[PDB]
């Protein structure tokens, strides 16, 4: 379901902040 | 020659809240002020006070009040 891909997308977005900044 | 800016105001948040007979964009001149308040269920007597400037005697406004029931009968 779309929601399961959306949940894992949101976790990867919060872990990408280890590696990037504005 | 266009109709004057005679308007329908509709308080409902789903629709364009002010519309002119001319098709003039009068709702864009509201500066994002909105009508926000409904008449609650089972509301009895209410007094509505309007004010007008720039009008002449013999012009009328109207107040229009829908009647929508959850059921085909009952609920009075």
């Amino acid at each position: 379901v779309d929601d399961a891909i959306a949940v894992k997308n949101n976790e990867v977005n919060k872990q990408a902040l280890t590696y990037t900044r504005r | 020659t266009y109709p004057a800016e005679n308007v329908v105001v509709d308080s409902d948040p789903r629709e364009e809240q002010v519309s002119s007979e001319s098709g003039s964009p009068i709702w864009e001149r509201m500066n994002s002020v909105r009508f926000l308040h409904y008449i609650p269920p089972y509301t009895g007597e209410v007094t509505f006070k309007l004010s007008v400037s720039g009008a002449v005697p013999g012009q009328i406004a109207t107040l229009r009040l829908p009647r929508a029931w959850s059921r085909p009968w009952g609920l009075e």
Binding site: N9, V12, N13, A16, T20 | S32
Partner: protein, 53 residues
Amino acid sequence: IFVERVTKLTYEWTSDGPKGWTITIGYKEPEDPILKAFELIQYINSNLGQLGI
């Protein structure tokens, strides 16, 4: 009321009619993390081009 500019408009239509519009108000970062990876790679390739000059 929070005000700023429409930065992205998406439209979608299917054989069941319109899905409507996706509107972004303000400057959101790409929702798919991989599109944020491609956005940083575009920035590098432009910098890497001027460093070669």
